[PDB]
Amino acid sequence: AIFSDRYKGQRVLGKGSFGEVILCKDKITGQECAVKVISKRQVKQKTDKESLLREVQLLKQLDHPNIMKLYEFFEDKGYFYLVGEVYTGGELFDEIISRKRFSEVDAARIIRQVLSGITYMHKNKIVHRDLKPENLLLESKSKDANIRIIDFGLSTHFEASKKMKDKIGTAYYIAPEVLHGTYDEKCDVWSTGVILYILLSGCPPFNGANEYDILKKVEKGKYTFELPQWKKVSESAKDLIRKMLTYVPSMRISARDALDHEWIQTYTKEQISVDVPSLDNAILNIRQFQGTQKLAQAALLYMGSKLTSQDETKELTAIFHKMDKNGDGQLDRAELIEGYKELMRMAVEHEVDQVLDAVDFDKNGYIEYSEFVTVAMDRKTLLSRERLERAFRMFDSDNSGKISSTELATIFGVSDVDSETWKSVLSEVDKNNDGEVDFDEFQQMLLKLCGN
Template identity: 85%
Template structure:
């Protein structure tokens, strides 16, 4: 497919000292109208996805010769290369990786998106640390799906494609099959369906028969094999879902073996969330931009761990119950008596937090929303970051944000006078009818419960 021909560059924003990856696609390679449509569909899908294990897209633009996708930089390389290097993974390491992949898939499936080309080459390691986070990439074959309709396009990669895809009638569980193949390879170093060429491989996939006969499987636990059997169930209706796979005994016990969080980190995270006062739309939009677009992987490593720890069902979102459990867990870690906790008081506070932090009002805290309100205030509200955010809203570079620029921020033709009046009443200290940088800065400090000048 032509849109798969690209090269990557790494650029540094000198103003923010932040690195980005740029996927550059030549328009000469995108000759067919359908190829351009596929590329634009990939961009639209990525814009909608907000999950710690899915590639983050910052910007998309084009000129006469090229399309450009600006994303986060991931320096750890492909999981494929790590497999080649290690040969086999321990159960603990394999569980940590597969749990992250399943979490991303669960989130996608919940949002009616199917990847359709999951393989180690499309799983990147954020960095070179042994416990590096996994990022799912390459959504070129992804699409929206309907629960009542089957997909028919025969697409994917030989080793990882599900048999029902070859038959031309399938649903989102094709992603679970692919992930099951990846798990099999991680634990054994060999694919479950192998052959001398692609034709031979696809014939074996079509039959769907695999074994644990190789010597290395003798050292693998029965629960791990059980999960593989459930993920590689030949009949899709009998195959485990991504969400149910996250609840499997092997993942819950094996991945938990390395699951630890620094108590002060969890405490400061929850304190930051509690202090957030999300009432002002301009301030909330600016803060979300800073949290989602202007933070680096290094800055969010600990928050990522905390988010995944709090996300009990692994769907990539925090709901009311998970927030309540997070509060209780903090009390336990601090050695406090949880039996004396007032559940109704906790519930009331969590509802207030959800109301303030849930920017898109969908009933959940998304990953970017969490990072935005949970990050260390001094880090998030650095002058460099504030200036970049202000510059994004101040489109004409006048040094002030006007009502027309606010309209652009919220994607409307104009902001009604009453809305603008309310914004100015809270922010415009010098009464000039616009918002300058210092007013913008003070607005964000107030929003975060920070009284610092």
């Protein structure tokens, strides 16, 4: 079984957990799929291969409309290839923030789907452990679309990335008992309870300035309904949340029994019988939450991509140098492609051609490979820079064009950028800052925070 014999890469879907997800296509049937590629080297394995193989085989036989469908599994010297069904509706919360109105009925429908998928998985002795909004995909970008839970069962066999770009946002959802090391399927009920709390209020129940702060709250396990917007919420919803966020797991309600709860039964009726006031403050809060999380993540990815492009700028120049037997610094289309491939090893024809368009539109002769290197790398870093700008713009909901010092403290705390470190970098960028930054200044800060 060779992965590449069956599937061709089409386009990247993202970096998710444990590795990158690539949209692939079956070479024979044309069938599209999402393949999670996990590098055995860059990621450690918890269990022996036999245990992993058995769990994979089980997963292939399981089917539920709220669980991502696993089709196939491949392995080579370097990697595991997990072939799943592709879902195109994006992350649940990125949908929710676009909505104009949101009620308890909406929240209930969402949670019943999650609880349903979880219950089926627990029946089969599969635990998630890292349940969070990022792991709730939509079959289509619509409030009517079905939810598919991704990454069930991965945490049992693979160690999580300790890189903060990977870690962002994880602290809010993790069960206290996971932190302390003794856990079972009840941890997934806890995470779901955290998600329900956020849907109804727009604010995490366990919150803080940074990762440790948040984890400290989770561990203590104390939370409240003190916020004003909890006045608009039914006692029934609050009651379920209490049961889901019960500290001791044996006393914590099960996924199965949570489906049976009065709130779920009452509010997921096809026919809306009960009062449905729009949880307007929760929406505003949820948008603020998502925006913050997305900007912090984009910031780390941007800094990461900057460093990566620095390495690859040096390598690419070295490679072309060797090829530059003449020493005139000019190469042809063939040579440029070959070198690009050399670096890649360290589709192709088309990417070089895009570069040459800008460089030498007429294509009359040879190319200053130096000029090529520059343009080539800028196209590689585009996604991250535009994504950064988009996240900045989205976070800036009033279109002020600026982010305040208070907002920066939140963004950087979530990002594990030390308070004293970022403030010092701000001072270097703008001596006369007024306790706010525009986009360019923010970007200048990030550059300085990654050795630039």
